[PDB]
Symmetry: D2
Subunit: 244 residues, 4 copies
Amino acid sequence: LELDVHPVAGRIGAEIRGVKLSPDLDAATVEAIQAALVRHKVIFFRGQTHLDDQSQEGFAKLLGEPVTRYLLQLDANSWHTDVTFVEAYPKASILRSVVAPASGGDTVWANTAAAYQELPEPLRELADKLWAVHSNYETEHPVVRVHPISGERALQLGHFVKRIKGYSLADSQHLFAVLQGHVTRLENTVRWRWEAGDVAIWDNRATQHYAVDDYGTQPRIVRRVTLAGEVPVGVDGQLSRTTR
Amino acid sequence: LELDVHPVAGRIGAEIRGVKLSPDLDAATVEAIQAALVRHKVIFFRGQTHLDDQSQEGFAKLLGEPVAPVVDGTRYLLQLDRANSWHTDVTFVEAYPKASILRSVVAPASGGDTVWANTAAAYQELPEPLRELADKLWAVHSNEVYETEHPVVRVHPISGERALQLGHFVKRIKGYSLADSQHLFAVLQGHVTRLENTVRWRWEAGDVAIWDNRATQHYAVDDYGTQPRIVRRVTLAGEVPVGVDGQLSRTTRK
Amino acid sequence: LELDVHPVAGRIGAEIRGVKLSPDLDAATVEAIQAALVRHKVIFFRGQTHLDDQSQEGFAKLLGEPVAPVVDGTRYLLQLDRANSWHTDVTFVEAYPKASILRSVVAPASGGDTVWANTAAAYQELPEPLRELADKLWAVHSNEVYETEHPVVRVHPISGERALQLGHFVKRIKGYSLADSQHLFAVLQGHVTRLENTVRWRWEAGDVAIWDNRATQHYAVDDYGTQPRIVRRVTLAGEVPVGVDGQLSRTTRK
Amino acid sequence: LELDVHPVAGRIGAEIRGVKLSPDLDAATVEAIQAALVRHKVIFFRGQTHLDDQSQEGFAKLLGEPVRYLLQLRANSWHTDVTFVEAYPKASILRSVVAPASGGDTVWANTAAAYQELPEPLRELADKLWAVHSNEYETEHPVVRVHPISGERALQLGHFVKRIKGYSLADSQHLFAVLQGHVTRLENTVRWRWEAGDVAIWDNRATQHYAVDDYGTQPRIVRRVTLAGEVPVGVDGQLSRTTR
């Protein structure tokens, strides 16, 4: 099954046309959506005007287990992967624009698997050995996660990182600045300008995102379903572990 | 005259609809365009499929004086066929351009974007003591062989808005050690490129952008691989910058 | 009264010879020691082999009011037997110590040094616009619970010299993003620890140092492994810092 | 032969007593001086007031080949000597002729100890880095040199480094900042206060140094002989190479 997929930026993001999202999508459509999500890291559906609160939730249950029963309304300008201070953080979110500012209000995502790939090989080999502590709860995650479906390595960082384990504070900051800098390099990101009825889904195992705060008092209301994720595995097979 | 103007991001960038760019635009149109440009810092016109190389150049001349290997059949049009680094144009010279008019000829199907940053918004958001420090700094800008000394804060000649004048041609902040110069540059430049002070544009063939080089930096995203990307540009001559205390930039080397 | 004073480094530190420290020092001697301390920021007395726990404490009371597990047979003496990180003492509180008197009891045969930095010299060497910025900054100090807000520039209550108040208890500079706070800290702290503003002392048993905590930071070098190192300290109570515009530090969490 | 050696700081520097330096020192004394130099990285001889200019040079020829050879000497910046050339000096012999009454110190850092204290994943990365050194002559040196006598690995950095080969400018700055910051960590250094007639000898393969500029116009006069060094060898046995 080939969806009508239109890549947005060169290294991340794709709009999918010709699909009306709903709890009744057939199994091939869902699988092609999951494939497009792994490949493109964030995917977009425009004009989902029919998709009410109940129908977003039931569509979401097709893609994983949610963490109306699960639909949250949000009425975050710092780069982060979702809830990484816990051990088995979300694998994905499904996010629908309900009220969109006439100007401003964008969201940006970064492709943390492309960020990992572009490091020189000695620097990839360092990153493969690093562990960081993430805090709001404190959890230790490998800096490099091996994705459980695609096997792609991705950098696991963002603003919940409190420090890189086994380094002085100064060295931790330098190493984080280098690796996080590759994440948010413009070439690894896609920025989306929302219209009401847009839906984005991203793979939280291989992205970070950032909500641009440039819209002043213009109202902005989005509704989110989050899907439950797995314990990260590092390159040498070790798993993340909550410590506090 | 009120053009049909649609802001793109909340602090920079606006698309103008209903205007077919050409050498024959009337005075009110040209003046409303010049006003939108100062206000929004970079403006966009889509669907300019009629606008060829001669017509782009003639349109340009309505906005200022084009600056002199050019596209055949023109005197000022440059073709660009990579610049993924934030900068204001040609700031290693003293009176660097005030604007460019850039047309998309061939646009990658994915990738290829250009991002602009509002250096006036970036200056305004600094805490007061930091604005006061920025008001005093001078930097040396270089193409490395030209070196020019500009104030870090330029008072815009039309709007009087103050804007940070930094970007990749900055060689160092005059009067500081190297380490101090890098930290201070990193602070001020980081406000320029903060997402909130930027707009990103995804080009389609026939798009034209015009930006105020006195109050922006830009960056071309190199994420498109071997997909052909071809744009053509006319640059307009600008003035010698004036700093907050009235002093002027000055070239110091060749 | 002129003491036998011998500068150690160009910009900080002096050994004073011909003085046996004790609780019985006359007023002229004590006054000349206090002036030496203000002037040189840390002073050194070697060969104080007669100076035991009680007599260190009695000598200390001639300089100020010691601040309240102490060494047995004393009220205020603290034994240290590691802090290899630049700091001014106890700056997470409001009226932090003005001085410490530190005696070497057991000194490693190799390693074990202490280094002090002159934060008054560090302030004076900054370019004027940067001193003007520092004169306006405030920082939050924390023990990692007490949080206190101090001006970055303290006007010394005896000499009037301005000095940077920073070091490892700084949590952040008030009014700035985190990245900006980091850069600004790094610049100003970097002038503090520039080698030319420091003096390093290699201890022998019976050495005593006294330093002016209002105008220094210090760092104990941890290069001596398991060689025993034992020093004993009396700390003297300080005043509430006053900034350049006369405002006072203030505790904000206790 | 055991010389009378008194270590100065915990991890570098030793004063050697009871030796009058001259061109006539015997083979056992020379060899025990060479061994002390390798072990402690910089060594000091005080009270060498007999030692004039010709005598300094003749003493130096016992340690290696000078590059007729005494230079009279501001360099307040951390560096290893002449690293912009391929076979930079292995050592210098420096005598204080006039010494400021206060100020005028020199500091040395042990780049072998600085390498060893890095966490193992970071040593493994440093083992793979090359840097370009320039007198703006440009030479490419491994960031880690294997010492040709002791086999100790040492960081080869300092102010002559223009960039770390293969990295963007930002990454090069960060990685240099981490590795050079270990070099200049106080624990890895020794600061010497000079008296007229003091002689220092340092192993320029495993140190950097810095002349403190805190003495104003007090006259300071030092005289130096420099000894020829070998082409550096990296951990995988590759040799440095001049490129410009």
